[model samples]
Target chain A: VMYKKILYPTDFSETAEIALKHVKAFKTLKAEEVILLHVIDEREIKVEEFENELKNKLTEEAKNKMENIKKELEDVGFKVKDIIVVGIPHEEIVKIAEDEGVDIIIMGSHGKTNLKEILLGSVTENVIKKSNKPVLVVKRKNS
Target chain B: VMYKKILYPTDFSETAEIALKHVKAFKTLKAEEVILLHVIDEREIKSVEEFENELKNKLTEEAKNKMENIKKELEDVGFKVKDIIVVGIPHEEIVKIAEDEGVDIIIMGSHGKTNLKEILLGSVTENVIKKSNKPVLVVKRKNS
Candidate 1:
């Protein structure tokens, strides 16, 4: 079946950008629209005031980044939307998939940290572990 | 990172068993062991008493026989493996053994017999890929 809507999550890194190009390739998968989501996880925050302010700033920055991605995809003729939120990456990705009723999710695996990925699992690992929807994980360009 | 040890799960069906030959080729990839796992679900066992014992013995014999043939076919190469017979759901048992043994990778058939014969029986492999910390290679058994 054709993917009507697809979700692409990012951290504004090289690998995340590579993942976006991959999403672009599937334009013919009957993908009507693509959602570019960037989540600013506020796990370390303890104080409500500081946390809210940080979240607001991060959301604004993420919105700008996602909009840039949307513009790039739209230039290649794809119906695109941008999303910026504050929460855990995996949880936000899964929640967006469920709430938005997205058919597929494409994201980068084993981000900037290479050594840490070998020992402790990465965000892609957690997202795949939790999400039931089909996930296409793009490897790091170096690996 | 060489694939030193490998595991292949099968149902003893002809098409499914074909992947055994595929697994043997991993010797070129520096693999030295091939573990074949067959999970005998408790539901597949008929009776709780003597029939259970009989079933175990029969399945054991079958596993040994198949493993021996596979060993001989590969010219006793890459060490014919565990020939394990576990009691649980197929996918769950495979993942458990993989973690316990710390095998480098798992190669499994892409699909199996079910109501949807042409469609991939991805639930098992999908579950394994999702939960497994180890890498998995799902081989496409047949072309649709």
Candidate 2:
């Protein structure tokens, strides 16, 4: 339970907010810092053969949203470093955890745009499969 | 980061042993309590109702032995361990016990002895997370 650093990935879903509750708890749980990450899942992009302009715009939009999230969490007194990346959600998440040497990852069980699915194509499952570090899945809210 | 109490459910698989490594680390991670649970999986027995009594007796006894060994292993590492073997569905029993016990977190392997060949996330682990209110830390097998 010694988290020197935590990886918190968000989809800006209400479920993701539940995960923030645990992240905020880490302020007293002996964590040194929290890394806030939001990935722009390339798989979800329309027109698979996309243009550079669209990709850059998407990344920029993600960065702005993450910056706002970081600020909000910071006000509550969490040492935070936020990043925005474009790739598959789970893949980017797992890579960041390893690259950042995070102690654990906290993520929502499902994301936006898949509100009706039972498992949401198992995005969280895929992340759990690939991640070497511990993945804390915050279950969906009001499920 | 501070786990006051951890719920560790096992099916006694090699994968479960991998999770034991993290449970052992609780000695230094400031965890005061460890609930070691092994459910008898009544569903797996009911289909063989012809030998219901015999099957329940044997399975319960086997679970008790496994839980005892696990309890000792965890207690030796300075954790106050409470082990239980119950007759119920694995996921339901695990989630219900975790809630009843008020554990801070639930930890288990991504897969178990049944070894339904998926990349990871066995039915039990998947279902428990789907049902439990507490956070679940899914431990993966090294080879997975």
Candidate 3:
């Protein structure tokens, strides 16, 4: 079956946002809806004041940016929606895909590099090995 | 938990040979054995000379000799490998071999030759991924 729903997860990085271009192309393959996601990592907590301020500011900014991305994706002819969750990035991406019944997952090779990104594994590789759905990994290359 | 039995499929191209180099890197993982598989496209069967004569076996003998060199290379680096030849679709043969043996991972070049005549025949690796219960590792060919 052709992809009816596509999931695109981003971390507000140039490399990660490049995948949005690929998502626009998937519309040609009959993707009807797009799910745009961003996760605010919770494990980086420090001072209460700094943590709360960063959380609120990042959440609002992320939501607005996702909306802009949604417009860009939709303008290219697919119904697009946005999601911002507060939790770990990789885990939230997987949970949303399963919860959303997304047909395909499009993500970059890496994101904002936490040491865990290197110590544990690349998020894209882990999701590729674990996800039952088809994934298109877009490497950040200068082509 | 180390990868012991490895299966490598090739199309006899320069890209595939490069992938063979990647296989060499796995020698340090201490895998005891490796399998080299080559699929003969149906169009390549027009020149079959299996039983012509004693001297007519030169091509088959030479193919074996090439395999021997690869085997020796791996063995020299402290591992054992078996060279295998098959005459079927590449991806189907790959899955069949994996199921028939205790294979740990199926290593493949990121991309291979493709043509309209074969109905995009080089997509065999993706089909293998669809069918294989085993893990498939696809190594990109530097710039393919």
Candidate 4:
């Protein structure tokens, strides 16, 4: 389908990279823009709970990584908005998708952490269950 | 991405109708064909061996009848429709056919006619997403 906007949630993992492939591929469907988002788990912050450099540690780290992703998408003729948020992955993803008002949420089926044990990630699972948008799940790299 | 062929597996639920909406929408993506598939769950047919043939026959018959309108809908959208009915488990049949038929994607809804109280994504949809190597565009119900 020809969509105006796309919300792409990435964890900088290979699975999410596969998702990026489709996000760029959808450009063929006249999908002109991609809202590239990365959510640093708030729980990880609470685990570090008390912070020094850790407050913006993950955020900045993700920002550094997202720079290249943003560039890659833009070169494909997509207007890319790179966003980094400190919150739950799935919840923040759904929120940005709604507030930004996109045509679809294109995401990986599983994250890197649980790719071996779970057939699907809890983050992706929650998004699939909770998000009102149609989810195009890109499965793992090989199996 | 623009797709050449699409494998649409329906259980004839209103949820599946929502999926049909997207298949028609993808006509813009230059989707020229739709393989309209309905899988007859053999578990629901077997273990009552005496009526096996009759049960299979009637189930396939019901599937054919239910699909007539959906088949017409795709053709109305100018798609070449390949209508099929098979006696197998839903998930296995769907994934296998997606490979055998060589479809660009699997377009289906989250749930079907089940009253077992799944919040979203009944088991068949989950299994297809798990098992299929191809892209699965799962159309969920609205958030209303």
At residue B118, candidate 4 shows an lDDT of 48
Q: Could you report the DockQ of all the candidates, in the order they appear?
A: 0.04, 0.40, 0.04, 0.59
Question: Which lDDT tens digits does candidate 1 get at residues A1-143?
Answer: 24568888888877677677767755653437888888776674446787788777777777777777888898877888777776787889888877888766877655555453363236776665556555655545443
C-alpha positional error of residue A36 in candidate 4 after TM-score superposition, expressed in Å: 1.2
Off by over 4 Å in 2: A27-33, A43-61, A71-79, A114-121, B1-3, B24-31, B46-51, B76-78, B116-119
> How do the candidates rank by TM-score, highest first?
4, 2, 1, 3
Q: What shift in Å separates residue A96 of candidate 4 from its native position after superposition?
A: 1.6
The candidates, ranked best first by lDDT, are 4, 2, 1, 3
Candidate 4, clashing residue pairs? A46-A49
lDDT (Cα, tens digit) per residue for candidate 4, span A48-121: 45564687677778888999999998888899988888888888998999999888888888776844757788
Better of 2 and 3 by lDDT: 2
- Which runs in model 4 stand beyond 4 Å of their true positions? A29-31, A47-50, B29-31, B47-50, B115-118
TM-score of chain B of 4: 0.91
Quote the lDDT for A92 in model 1: 92
Question: DockQ: which candidate is best?
Answer: 4
| TM-score of each candidate structure, all chains considered together | 0.50, 0.79, 0.50, 0.89
lDDT for B115 in candidate 2 is: 70
**Which 10-residue span in candidate 3 chain A carries the lowest summed lDDT?**
A114-123
3 or 4, greater by lDDT: 4
